Amino acid sequence: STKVNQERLASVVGRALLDKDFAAQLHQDPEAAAKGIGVHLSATEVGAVKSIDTAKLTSAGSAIRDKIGVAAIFDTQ
Amino acid sequence: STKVNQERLASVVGRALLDKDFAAQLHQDPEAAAKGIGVHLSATEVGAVKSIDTAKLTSAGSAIRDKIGVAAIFDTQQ
């Protein structure tokens, strides 16, 4: 689609919710951050991602970030 | 992976950030909400998803929800 590839956008903003360092990189430099994980944001998607307030995302994400991080380190197959 | 399939989890919580109604279905009934979009959450991922406060997620996502919603309706192919 031209403006919204909603599954690729979900991968990007979902990672931001799950990853404070990625969220911050994405807020500072969205097209480049998303390219680094293999996603192309349209100019529509870049402006939408910039409308995510980092403090508000941290407030929403801080609990799940902690819980998924502890699980990830020694995760098995 | 047993506990964390991080790309599938990102698809799920990313959709929640972008979709108030999905976020609410996921909070109420996480395993079934995720199955509905073809994701299997581990019990670890279910407890993790339950730790997303709906009001806090709405606060974080209200602006991007509005902006993506208006763009999506008449979106074209390239």
Numbering used by the authors:
A (entry chain B): 2 to 78
B (entry chain A): 2 to 79
The authors write:
In the present study, we focused on one of these gene clusters, Cluster OS3 (consisting of four successive genes Os1348–1351 in the genome of Os17), which was predicted to be a bacteriocin gene cluster, and we constructed a deficient mutant of each gene. We found that the deficient mutant of Os1348, which encodes an 85-aa small protein, exhibited weaker antibiotic activity than wild-type Os17. The Os1348 protein was annotated as an alpha chain of nitrile hydratase. Based on the results of biological investigations, the full-length Os1348 protein may be a bacteriocin precursor and appears to be post-translationally modified into an active form by the products of downstream genes.
The full-length Os1348 protein was overexpressed in E. coli, purified, and crystallized. The Os1348 structure was elucidated by the molecular replacement method using the ideal helices mode at a resolution of 1.9 Å. The final model included four Os1348 molecules consisting of 2–79 residues in the asymmetric unit. The six C-terminal residues were not observed in the electron density map and appeared to be highly flexible. aValues for the highest resolution shell are given in parentheses.The Os1348 monomer was composed of six α helices (α1-α6) and formed a Magatama (comma)-shaped α-structure. Two Os1348 monomers joined and formed a dimeric structure. The Os1348 dimer had a semicircular shape. The dimer interface was composed of many hydrophobic amino acids from the α1, α4, α5, and α6 helices. Based on its three-dimensional structure, the free energy values ΔGint and ΔGdiss of the Os1348 dimer were calculated by the PISA website as −20.4 and 17.0 kcal/mol, respectively, suggesting that the Os1348 protein formed a stable homodimer in solution. Although the Os1348 protein was annotated as an alpha chain of nitrile hydratase, no structural similarities to the nitrile hydratases registered in the PDB were observed.
